[PDB]
Amino acid sequence: FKIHDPEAKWISDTEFIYREQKGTVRLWNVETNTSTVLIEGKKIESLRAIRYEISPDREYALFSYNVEPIYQHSYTGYYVLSKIPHGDPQSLDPPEVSNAKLQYAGWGPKGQQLIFIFENNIYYCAHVGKQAIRVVSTGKEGVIYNGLSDWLYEEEILKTHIAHWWSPDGTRLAYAAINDSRVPIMELPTYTGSIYPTVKPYHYPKAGSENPSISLHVIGLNGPTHDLEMMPPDDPRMREYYITMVKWATSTKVAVTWLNRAQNVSILTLCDATTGVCTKKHEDESEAWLHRQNEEPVFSKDGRKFFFIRAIPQGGRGKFYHITVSSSQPNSSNDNIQSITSGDWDVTKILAYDEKGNKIYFLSTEDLPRRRQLYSANTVGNFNRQCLSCDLVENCTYFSASFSHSMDFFLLKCEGPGVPMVTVHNTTDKKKMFDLETNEHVKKAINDRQMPKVEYRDIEIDDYNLPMQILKPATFTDTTHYPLLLVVDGTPGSQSVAEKFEVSWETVMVSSHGAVVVKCDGRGSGFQGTKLLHEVRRRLGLLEEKDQMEAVRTMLKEQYIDRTRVAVFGKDYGGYLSTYILPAKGENQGQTFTCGSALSPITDFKLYASAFSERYLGLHGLDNRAYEMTKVAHRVSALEEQQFLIIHPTADEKIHFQHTAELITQLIRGKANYSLQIYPDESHYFTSSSLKQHLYRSIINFFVECFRI
Amino acid sequence: HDPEAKWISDTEFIYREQKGTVRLWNVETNTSTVLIEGKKIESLRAIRYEISPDREYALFSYNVEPIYQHSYTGYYVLSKIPHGDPQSLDPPEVSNAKLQYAGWGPKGQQLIFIFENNIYYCAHVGKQAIRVVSTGKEGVIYNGLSDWLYEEEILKTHIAHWWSPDGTRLAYAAINDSRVPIMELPTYTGSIYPTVKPYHYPKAGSENPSISLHVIGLNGTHDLEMMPPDDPRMREYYITMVKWATSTKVAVTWLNRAQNVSILTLCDATTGVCTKKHEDESEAWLHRQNEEPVFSKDGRKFFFIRAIPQGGRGKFYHITVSSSQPNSSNDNIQSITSGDWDVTKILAYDEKGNKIYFLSTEDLPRRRQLYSANTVGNFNRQCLSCDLVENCTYFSASFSHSMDFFLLKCEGPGVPMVTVHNTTDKKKMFDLETNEHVKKAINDRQMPKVEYRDIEIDDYNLPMQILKPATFTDTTHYPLLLVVDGTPGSQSVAEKFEVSWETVMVSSHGAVVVKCDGRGSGFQGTKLLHEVRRRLGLLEEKDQMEAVRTMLKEQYIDRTRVAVFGKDYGGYLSTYILPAKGENQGQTFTCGSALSPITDFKLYASAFSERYLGLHGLDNRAYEMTKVAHRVSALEEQQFLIIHPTADEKIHFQHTAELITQLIRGKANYSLQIYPDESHYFTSSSLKQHLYRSIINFFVECFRI
């Protein structure tokens, strides 16, 4: 079942890197079916170097290897530079330091120039032998950051460990400075270190507290290494601000997104990298918040009119996220907004724009919110949407793509509901010349076992068509009864009902232990309208609760389903929901769920990060009158007979153990029946394979025990 | 019920509260003098109260909460003898604040109080608070109160001040914790930002706190400190017993960190000079280091409890006479009591003739009877209580100042009993307390049938107690549930009366509960005590499986339903009794559990681990076979459960978490529960009843079929 996905990227407009398929790194050329071998099995001897990157001059290779990330992806460790053919592995060491751990190096936009960050200190090296330059070092251990992300950015808004950008000229570098000194620092207990283990402290801004300061600066990649700060906008509702991402529109101009602390006012600003002068290019605001600040304008090579994406009213069903064309330097007289496409759907991402005509390539849910396909349109007023896949292959409906430098070719991937089909196509013929990777071993594997029957029964509630997917054990019969399991995510801005290939524990007990699993996307689910997303605002945990109530009731209509064996599971915020979903239906036909489970729930959002709680319920520290009833302690009153289980690693970073401890205190005060399980001193994102096997085995054992009868 | 009466004189005892007010009963003609009334309610329900030695001031301890096993910290308020007029007891320039201890003197209204680990004394209630000593520190320098270790492990009591018989000087221990490693207990509930709480917990092989002894005068008041002995093998030492031999002389027991070399020394309180009296050594360790001396009115020959070789069945605990000033060459050691039995502790000694009263297990190890011997060479040990009341196998007699009268407490195996008797006639003129509510409760409820079936292994007979639901038959199968404690230097099986979870589960579902005094049980010869030296968790489990095999040969005891349970070290043993009996005859148990167990002793305190496994820090090589990691290997499907409070300072939750880590590496099914941020002993009754609810709720499901 393991996927040998290379996931290459277009090095040039004619060829891509052609990453590992079953070992040594080749380099495929689309021109005439040519796969030049560049890296051999020598990476095995590089102390098992996990990651590798190729310089823009394809003359030096960086190989990074470590043991474990920190928050989500802290790809630190040892970084070694090697010649492109082979040989001479040298550990990239910071100045006046021998071989030591290195957080990240990366590559420049040209030649063999690069940087590398050690203890929040950017060190530039134009050449292999170039001495590392202390360009900026004001960052500190857990106090001040520059070039990398803290917990808050890497887990809430940035979602990326790297926090700096290379200018196109390869002469300037934009880095974000983070002041975490004000942030309260909380410690995680250690129960495995030594006879006297010590706690692990890190800064974690809780709800109602303040948030770390942010600023953006530019350094020089040569000579003086001159630094210039960019002033944030000073709107009356922007006392505290966030920089989501920035992009080099040119080598001297940078597009910056500034979001107020209330998160209901965003500003796109064009700032001069070489001067520091910031010029606002766009402004947007909403009553509650600005959703999806994770988008990038498509700026041309010359910095001509760019292609952003934003919420257009879309008539009914609320406003939808659609592409927009805006001039390079819009005048203050009026906005140049021009929605490329419009419909009851959204553009998940915009691939690129071909300057050689009217060709805007993007990925969207235009077919359906539960499927992702590649589409293209024309930038000029005709706006003729053009197929590229639009169900190119019947087996796979999910799609993604990456185009070349001049849109000459593009890599494409299916990854659902079939095996990931990594293939190379061209914009002109729109026909596969050859297959890049198909993982036919996974094909015969899924054909070698009882692949569960996938089906979809969408429901309707209020003025919304709520998606839904349901599984069968591939031997299903309508007369025989089957126990029910629900999987709940309900994460604001997320989707559970999607046609993307994935195999996990749910399939494991569906095929083996004979279960039927339900995935739903209630109110507030993403990609189905900004209005629907904002329905749950200031009403967290209630509307979606009724959505899953109706889902359970509809699933109980079946004559092939059980009622004495019903269960619900969730994780993260979905864990909180799954806890909040233990009712007794009516008063006579109660016992809605036979057994329950959860994993790292979020009991009180005051005990969570501020960027989440303030965003979805308003800023705390002012008696928001919204974090009280959202405590599940009120709803866990009944807890009559359901067998409840909690899973929580000790050293969780995203969702602190304080939540579980408080919920356990509530259970004690309520005399509830449950069984807790813990992972001593383990990270939240839980990236160990054997431990993952243990966790899934525990889940399936508990669920089959509460379903055996 | 409990009168908890203590003597003020031979004629009268305090006769404390039974069901409210407190009268001062007098033995002579049943005279209960009116001293305390329902006035105790107005002082915010002061849990504890005391009477000044002049019987003119009453001290209430209100808003007192327990930090450790017994940390009587709270607000102490004095009041007049009749009723009313409270007044806050405070150090100078300090408002109403919690005081860790107050205490009381032997004469008049003199008293002390401890604030920030500092003793402040006043000879009078109206006397201004005096900074007699203020050198103590919060958790670093303790004077007047014990640390965690002394309150828990060796001294077994929080109070650390001893008044002189004349009430002129105080003997107190200065404990320095600046040389102790610290533990930061994780707090999860204190606030939105809960921070750890630090307290000095010396683990095995760590640096123990340094103890010194001091005596402070109560008049005039300069401190004077004593030299302990300086034997080469006691470079690290502790004070395991201290008591004023006279108004100027005090008996102190200095024991090495190896806990196998102890010295009893008589020292001058007003000078600080010490005079060595006795020494005691053993290859494994010493037992009952807290034995206070039994001196005389003139400070002559005192009484000691020595494990004399006693020929067969190993050495036994017998009383010994040590002359007033023994010669340098040799002492006047001479055992009074003899035979294959042990004296639990000496009640009292009569200087007006020859009558030494004590409790002993001469009848049975699980029974306590009162015996009185003579100091003269005849050694006529007489049983005085014997069988005064049929429902009394346990006994506890507190004798008066002139000793002609005493108070006898039964405490099982039936309803506990409190009575007043005279030592001469052994006559019950009246009953102090019959525990009427206890009788009416036991009569109206299904009392479980208690019976005993002792086992014999090697040269040790281990008593065992087994219960029945008072509806015993043969057609019904009784699922066995072993209960193991196995505390070294302690007795687990006896004829005492109890009401516990085992009683409830036997009454409700009739599952037989077995208790056996495994190897290491006390009061049965020091041979059994030292047999398990460096052999912990290895020999008691043999006794347990052989005992349960003997009880399992009964057809009404089934193989499908077998359980093991324990708490603290007993929890670890319970975990250690989950084997696979061969391979064909597996499923030795069905549901297993533990309560804050200890598996790897290197994560435990030095005074406990090193007492049996040798001092850590030098690779003793004995600690390393004591882990249940190898014994939790198979554990195919039998239920396994853990209960552990987060802030258990007795056994750290780190133990349980390391067990979880090892189980994850072993990949065996289990369960777990948490009590976030509470101490070990469940001071609140609500937590205790929730624990019992969880225990019974788990155990019912592991057998029902």
Side-chain angles (χ1 to χ4, degrees), chain A residues 678-690:
Chain A
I678 198 166
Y679 286 126
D681 283 322
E682 292 312 310
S683 297
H684 171 241
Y685 277 167
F686 180 60
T687 75
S688 162
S689 296
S690 173

PDB file of all heavy atoms in Angstrom, chain A residues 678-690:
ATOM      1  N   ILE A 678      -2.767   7.201  27.169  1.00  0.00           N
ATOM      2  CA  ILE A 678      -1.799   8.283  27.081  1.00  0.00           C
ATOM      3  C   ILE A 678      -0.573   7.802  26.319  1.00  0.00           C
ATOM      4  O   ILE A 678      -0.253   6.609  26.303  1.00  0.00           O
ATOM      5  CB  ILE A 678      -1.414   8.789  28.492  1.00  0.00           C
ATOM      6  CG1 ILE A 678      -0.765  10.172  28.429  1.00  0.00           C
ATOM      7  CG2 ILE A 678      -0.500   7.795  29.193  1.00  0.00           C
ATOM      8  CD1 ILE A 678      -0.678  10.854  29.775  1.00  0.00           C
ATOM      9  N   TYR A 679       0.103   8.740  25.668  1.00  0.00           N
ATOM     10  CA  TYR A 679       1.395   8.478  25.039  1.00  0.00           C
ATOM     11  C   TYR A 679       2.447   9.323  25.736  1.00  0.00           C
ATOM     12  O   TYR A 679       2.447  10.560  25.584  1.00  0.00           O
ATOM     13  CB  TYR A 679       1.353   8.778  23.543  1.00  0.00           C
ATOM     14  CG  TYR A 679       0.605   7.729  22.764  1.00  0.00           C
ATOM     15  CD1 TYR A 679      -0.449   8.069  21.933  1.00  0.00           C
ATOM     16  CD2 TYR A 679       0.942   6.390  22.882  1.00  0.00           C
ATOM     17  CE1 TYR A 679      -1.140   7.104  21.230  1.00  0.00           C
ATOM     18  CE2 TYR A 679       0.262   5.420  22.184  1.00  0.00           C
ATOM     19  CZ  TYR A 679      -0.778   5.780  21.360  1.00  0.00           C
ATOM     20  OH  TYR A 679      -1.457   4.809  20.665  1.00  0.00           O
ATOM     21  N   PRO A 680       3.351   8.717  26.505  1.00  0.00           N
ATOM     22  CA  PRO A 680       4.265   9.499  27.351  1.00  0.00           C
ATOM     23  C   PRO A 680       5.303  10.233  26.516  1.00  0.00           C
ATOM     24  O   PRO A 680       6.093   9.615  25.799  1.00  0.00           O
ATOM     25  CB  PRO A 680       4.907   8.438  28.254  1.00  0.00           C
ATOM     26  CG  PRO A 680       4.065   7.197  28.074  1.00  0.00           C
ATOM     27  CD  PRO A 680       3.536   7.271  26.688  1.00  0.00           C
ATOM     28  N   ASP A 681       5.292  11.563  26.619  1.00  0.00           N
ATOM     29  CA  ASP A 681       6.284  12.433  25.992  1.00  0.00           C
ATOM     30  C   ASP A 681       6.342  12.205  24.480  1.00  0.00           C
ATOM     31  O   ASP A 681       7.368  11.820  23.915  1.00  0.00           O
ATOM     32  CB  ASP A 681       7.658  12.235  26.639  1.00  0.00           C
ATOM     33  CG  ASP A 681       7.770  12.924  27.985  1.00  0.00           C
ATOM     34  OD1 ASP A 681       7.223  14.037  28.130  1.00  0.00           O
ATOM     35  OD2 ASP A 681       8.392  12.347  28.901  1.00  0.00           O
ATOM     36  N   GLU A 682       5.211  12.457  23.827  1.00  0.00           N
ATOM     37  CA  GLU A 682       5.081  12.269  22.391  1.00  0.00           C
ATOM     38  C   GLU A 682       4.500  13.523  21.756  1.00  0.00           C
ATOM     39  O   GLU A 682       3.625  14.180  22.327  1.00  0.00           O
ATOM     40  CB  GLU A 682       4.195  11.062  22.063  1.00  0.00           C
ATOM     41  CG  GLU A 682       4.799   9.722  22.451  1.00  0.00           C
ATOM     42  CD  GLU A 682       6.235   9.571  21.991  1.00  0.00           C
ATOM     43  OE1 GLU A 682       6.509   9.817  20.798  1.00  0.00           O
ATOM     44  OE2 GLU A 682       7.090   9.202  22.823  1.00  0.00           O
ATOM     45  N   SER A 683       4.997  13.846  20.565  1.00  0.00           N
ATOM     46  CA  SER A 683       4.509  15.006  19.839  1.00  0.00           C
ATOM     47  C   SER A 683       3.086  14.769  19.339  1.00  0.00           C
ATOM     48  O   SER A 683       2.634  13.632  19.175  1.00  0.00           O
ATOM     49  CB  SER A 683       5.433  15.334  18.665  1.00  0.00           C
ATOM     50  OG  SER A 683       6.727  15.690  19.119  1.00  0.00           O
ATOM     51  N   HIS A 684       2.375  15.871  19.099  1.00  0.00           N
ATOM     52  CA  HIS A 684       0.969  15.783  18.717  1.00  0.00           C
ATOM     53  C   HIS A 684       0.800  15.176  17.331  1.00  0.00           C
ATOM     54  O   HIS A 684       0.001  14.252  17.141  1.00  0.00           O
ATOM     55  CB  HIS A 684       0.326  17.165  18.766  1.00  0.00           C
ATOM     56  CG  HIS A 684      -1.052  17.207  18.185  1.00  0.00           C
ATOM     57  ND1 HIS A 684      -1.378  17.993  17.100  1.00  0.00           N
ATOM     58  CD2 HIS A 684      -2.186  16.553  18.531  1.00  0.00           C
ATOM     59  CE1 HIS A 684      -2.655  17.826  16.808  1.00  0.00           C
ATOM     60  NE2 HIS A 684      -3.169  16.957  17.660  1.00  0.00           N
ATOM     61  N   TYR A 685       1.540  15.686  16.346  1.00  0.00           N
ATOM     62  CA  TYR A 685       1.334  15.243  14.974  1.00  0.00           C
ATOM     63  C   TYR A 685       1.808  13.818  14.740  1.00  0.00           C
ATOM     64  O   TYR A 685       1.469  13.237  13.704  1.00  0.00           O
ATOM     65  CB  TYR A 685       2.001  16.220  14.011  1.00  0.00           C
ATOM     66  CG  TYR A 685       1.110  17.408  13.736  1.00  0.00           C
ATOM     67  CD1 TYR A 685       1.598  18.546  13.118  1.00  0.00           C
ATOM     68  CD2 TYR A 685      -0.224  17.392  14.121  1.00  0.00           C
ATOM     69  CE1 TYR A 685       0.776  19.630  12.880  1.00  0.00           C
ATOM     70  CE2 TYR A 685      -1.050  18.469  13.884  1.00  0.00           C
ATOM     71  CZ  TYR A 685      -0.545  19.587  13.263  1.00  0.00           C
ATOM     72  OH  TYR A 685      -1.362  20.666  13.024  1.00  0.00           O
ATOM     73  N   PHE A 686       2.573  13.250  15.673  1.00  0.00           N
ATOM     74  CA  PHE A 686       2.631  11.805  15.864  1.00  0.00           C
ATOM     75  C   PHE A 686       3.118  11.096  14.595  1.00  0.00           C
ATOM     76  O   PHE A 686       2.394  10.338  13.949  1.00  0.00           O
ATOM     77  CB  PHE A 686       1.248  11.315  16.304  1.00  0.00           C
ATOM     78  CG  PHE A 686       1.163   9.849  16.544  1.00  0.00           C
ATOM     79  CD1 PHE A 686       1.953   9.250  17.504  1.00  0.00           C
ATOM     80  CD2 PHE A 686       0.277   9.072  15.822  1.00  0.00           C
ATOM     81  CE1 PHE A 686       1.866   7.904  17.736  1.00  0.00           C
ATOM     82  CE2 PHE A 686       0.191   7.724  16.047  1.00  0.00           C
ATOM     83  CZ  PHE A 686       0.983   7.140  17.008  1.00  0.00           C
ATOM     84  N   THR A 687       4.370  11.380  14.236  1.00  0.00           N
ATOM     85  CA  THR A 687       4.930  10.985  12.949  1.00  0.00           C
ATOM     86  C   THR A 687       5.820   9.747  13.039  1.00  0.00           C
ATOM     87  O   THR A 687       6.831   9.662  12.334  1.00  0.00           O
ATOM     88  CB  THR A 687       5.710  12.149  12.339  1.00  0.00           C
ATOM     89  OG1 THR A 687       6.962  12.296  13.020  1.00  0.00           O
ATOM     90  CG2 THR A 687       4.918  13.442  12.469  1.00  0.00           C
ATOM     91  N   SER A 688       5.471   8.786  13.889  1.00  0.00           N
ATOM     92  CA  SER A 688       6.206   7.532  14.000  1.00  0.00           C
ATOM     93  C   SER A 688       5.353   6.395  13.455  1.00  0.00           C
ATOM     94  O   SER A 688       4.177   6.270  13.812  1.00  0.00           O
ATOM     95  CB  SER A 688       6.601   7.247  15.447  1.00  0.00           C
ATOM     96  OG  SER A 688       6.931   5.880  15.611  1.00  0.00           O
ATOM     97  N   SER A 689       5.950   5.567  12.594  1.00  0.00           N
ATOM     98  CA  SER A 689       5.188   4.519  11.918  1.00  0.00           C
ATOM     99  C   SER A 689       4.746   3.425  12.885  1.00  0.00           C
ATOM    100  O   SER A 689       3.572   3.041  12.902  1.00  0.00           O
ATOM    101  CB  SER A 689       6.015   3.929  10.777  1.00  0.00           C
ATOM    102  OG  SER A 689       6.268   4.901   9.778  1.00  0.00           O
ATOM    103  N   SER A 690       5.674   2.899  13.689  1.00  0.00           N
ATOM    104  CA  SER A 690       5.321   1.817  14.605  1.00  0.00           C
ATOM    105  C   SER A 690       4.333   2.288  15.664  1.00  0.00           C
ATOM    106  O   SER A 690       3.382   1.571  16.006  1.00  0.00           O
ATOM    107  CB  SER A 690       6.580   1.249  15.259  1.00  0.00           C
ATOM    108  OG  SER A 690       6.249   0.307  16.265  1.00  0.00           O
TER     109      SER A 690
END
